[PDB]
RNA sequence: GGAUUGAAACGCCAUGCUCAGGCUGGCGAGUGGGCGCCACUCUCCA
């Protein structure tokens, strides 16, 4: 694995003075090694329902979105 | 169309199982033993 994220660049300076940009993986402390303990065989059934929020407009209805969800889930 | 302690994340670069050595020297298959005793092609038609 990697040790750090990419910083924000400045476009205008980039072509106002042409320079290369990159992150070099292989160099020194950049390289990081991480282990993982994980599950192997899973299966779940989850019960959840629906609710409108304050941002919602007056035309919104929970039932319509629920039906859309059902259609999509059936179709895959 | 904001958000799964999430969104990104190589085990990588390369290294002879090698040099060499006899299965060799030599030893008899050999001494000697009867295929023997005896048996009708024979009785007819110019």
Using the CA of A31, give the nucleotide whose C1' is nearest. B9
Q: Which residues contact A61 (CB under 8 A, 6 or more apart)?
A: A52
- For chain A, how big is the Rg over CA atoms in Å? 24
- The residues near A9 (Cβ < 8 Å, ≥ 6 apart) are A21
Nearest to A51 by CA among A59, A61, A43: A61
What approach was used to elucidate this structure?
cryo-EM
Q: Is the CB of A2 under 7 A from strand B?
A: yes
CA A67 to chain CA centroid, nearest Å: 26
Q: Which of A25, A44, A45 is nearest to A33 (CA)?
A: A25
Task: Name residues whose C-beta falls within 8 Å of residue A34's C-beta, 6 or more positions apart in sequence.
Answer: A1
Resolution (A): 2.8
Q: Answer for A5: CB within 7 Å of strand B.
A: yes
């Amino acid at each position: 694995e990697v040790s750090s994220k990419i910083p924000k660049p400045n476009p205008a300076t980039a072509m106002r003075d042409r320079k290369p940009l990159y992150f070099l993986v292989d160099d020194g402390s950049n390289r990081q090694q991480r282990a993982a303990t994980l599950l192997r065989n899973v299966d779940y059934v989850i019960e959840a329902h629906f609710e409108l929020t304050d941002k919602a407009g007056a035309e919104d209805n929970a039932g319509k979105h629920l039906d859309i969800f059902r259609r999509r889930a059936r179709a895959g």
